[PDB]
């Protein structure tokens, strides 16, 4: 069940590769993937390359994959352990979602943070009251950890 | 498209929900077991699994597709039966 669905996703990724992310299994553990996401243009992450680890559950797609950044990133919805606060990875997961769609949602999160439901309150505070300070710090972390 | 949004394969025994969406019988059943009363595509409230999509099943009897692993041309109404038994599939899994 889950294994065939994961294989199908990998094949569709190879047949129409996305313009701004790559993803695939680590060795021949089909349930353990690594992904790369480009920092979005017009965001403070622009020019950066961010690595993610993906663990699929054995009842996928009925439970969400576990997704975390391994590259350090300064963002109000991603913490120092790489955990991602994103509703489609939790209560709003649906079985029609795919890794391709998750990666697009994470790119959208980088472009447009959600400072009102944050994972890191201190960063959300800066994002809301001093946007250019947030931009400067996020850019500095991109230059240090993602390039 | 005759694909199921849940399993991503060609529909098998398609079922249509009240919100108009069509899934394999086993896919919408398993979806509702895991997240009750909810469409697995549009998240609309669903009071039941739905009804057999006999119109979709009829249309699939005259459609054909090449097997993703052995390239043989297979009728869509028989695609699940093919991938169950195709040696190129069995070989990979
Ligand atoms: Zn299905
Ligand atoms: Zn629906
Ligand atoms: Zn075949």
UniProtKB/Swiss-Prot annotation, chain A:
Effect the entry attributes to changing residue 93 to A: Abolishes histone H3 ubiquitination and decreases interaction with PHF7
Record GO biological process: protein autoubiquitination; protein K48-linked ubiquitination; protein modification process; protein polyubiquitination; protein ubiquitination; ubiquitin-dependent protein catabolic process
Keywords linked to the UniProt accession: ATP-binding, Nucleotide-binding, Transferase, Ubl conjugation pathway
Name under which the protein is recorded: Ubiquitin-conjugating enzyme E2 D2
EC numbers, comma separated: 2.3.2.23, 2.3.2.24
Domain UBC core, first and last residues per copy: 1-147
Source superkingdom: Eukaryota
Family statement drawn from the similarity comment of this UniProt entry: Belongs to the ubiquitin-conjugating enzyme family.
Subunit record text: Interacts with SCF (SKP1-CUL1-F-box protein) E3 ubiquitin ligase complex. Interacts with CNOT4 (via RING domain). Interacts with E3 ubiquitin-protein ligases CBLC, PJA1 and PJA2. Interacts with PDZRN3. Interacts with PPP1R11. Interacts with E3 ubiquitin-protein ligase PHF7; the interaction inhibits cleavage of PHF7 and promotes association of the complex with the nucleosome core particle.
InterPro entries: UBQ-conjugat_E2_core, UBQ-conjugating_AS, UBQ-conjugating_enzyme/RWD
Reaction catalysed by this enzyme: S-ubiquitinyl-[E1 ubiquitin-activating enzyme]-L-cysteine + [E2 ubiquitin-conjugating enzyme]-L-cysteine = [E1 ubiquitin-activating enzyme]-L-cysteine + S-ubiquitinyl-[E2 ubiquitin-conjugating enzyme]-L-cysteine; S-ubiquitinyl-[E1 ubiquitin-activating enzyme]-L-cysteine + [acceptor protein]-L-lysine = [E1 ubiquitin-activating enzyme]-L-cysteine + N(6)-monoubiquitinyl-[acceptor protein]-L-lysine
GO cellular component: cytosol; extracellular exosome; nucleoplasm; nucleus; protein-containing complex
Natural source organism: Homo sapiens (Human)
Taxonomic classification: Eukaryota, Metazoa, Chordata, Craniata, Vertebrata
From Swiss-Prot, chain B:
Tissue expression remark: Predominantly expressed in lymphoid tissues, including bone marrow, spleen and thymus. Also weakly expressed in other tissues. Predominant in the CD4(+) and CD8(+) T-cells, suggesting that it is preferentially confined to T-cells.
Region (Linker region) residue spans: 87-93
Zinc finger (C2HC RNF-type): 67-86
Chain positions of all zinc fingers (RING-type): 4-43
Region feature Interaction with the RING-type zinc finger, mapped onto this chain: 76-80
Localization (cell): Golgi apparatus membrane
Induction: Down-regulated by miR-15b. Down-regulated in BRAFi resistant melanomas, leading to increased levels of JAK1 and possibly promoting BRAFi resistance.
Result when mutating residue 24 to A: Abolishes ability to regulate T-cell activation and E3 ligase activity in vitro
Disease cited in the entry: Tenorio syndrome: A disease characterized by overgrowth, macrocephaly, and intellectual disability. Some patients may have mild hydrocephaly, hypoglycemia, and inflammatory diseases resembling Sjogren syndrome.
Self-association and partners: Interacts with UBE2D1. Interacts with VCP/p97; leading to recruit RNF125 to RIGI and promote ubiquitination of RIGI.
Domain-related comment: The C2HC RNF-type zinc finger and the linker region stabilize the RING-type zinc finger, leading to promote binding of the RING-type zinc finger to the ubiquitin-conjugating enzyme E2 (donor ubiquitin).
Protein's UniProt name: E3 ubiquitin-protein ligase RNF125
């Amino acid at each position: 069940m889950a294994l065939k669905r994961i294989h199908k996703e990998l094949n569709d990724l190879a047949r129409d590769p996305p313009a701004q992310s790559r993803a695939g299994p680590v060795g021949d553990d089909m349930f353990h993937w690594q992904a790369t996401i480009m920092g979005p243009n017009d965001s403070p992450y622009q020019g950066g390359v961010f690595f993610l680890t993906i663990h699929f559950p054995t009842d996928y797609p009925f439970k969400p994959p576990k997704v975390a950044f391994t590259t350090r990133i300064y963002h109000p919805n991603i913490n120092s352990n790489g955990s991602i606060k994103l509703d489609i990875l939790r209560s709003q997961w649906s079985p029609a979602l795919t890794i391709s769609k998750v990666l697009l949602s994470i790119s959208s999160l980088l472009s447009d943070p959600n400072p009102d439901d944050p994972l890191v309150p201190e960063i959300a505070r800066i994002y809301k009251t001093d946007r250019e300070k947030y931009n400067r710090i996020a850019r500095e972390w991109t230059q240090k950890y993602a390039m | 498209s005759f694909d199921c949004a849940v399993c991503l394969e060609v529909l098998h025994q398609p079922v249509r929900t009240r919100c108009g969406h069509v899934f394999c019988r086993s896919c919408i059943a398993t979806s509702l077991k895991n997240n009750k009363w909810t469409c697995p595509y549009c998240r609309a409230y669903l009071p039941s699994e739905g009804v057999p999509a006999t119109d979709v099943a009829k249309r699939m009897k005259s459609e054909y597709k090449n097997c993703a692993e052995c390239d043989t041309l297979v009728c869509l109404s028989e695609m699940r039966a093919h991938i169950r038994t195709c040696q190129k599939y069995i070989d990979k899994y």
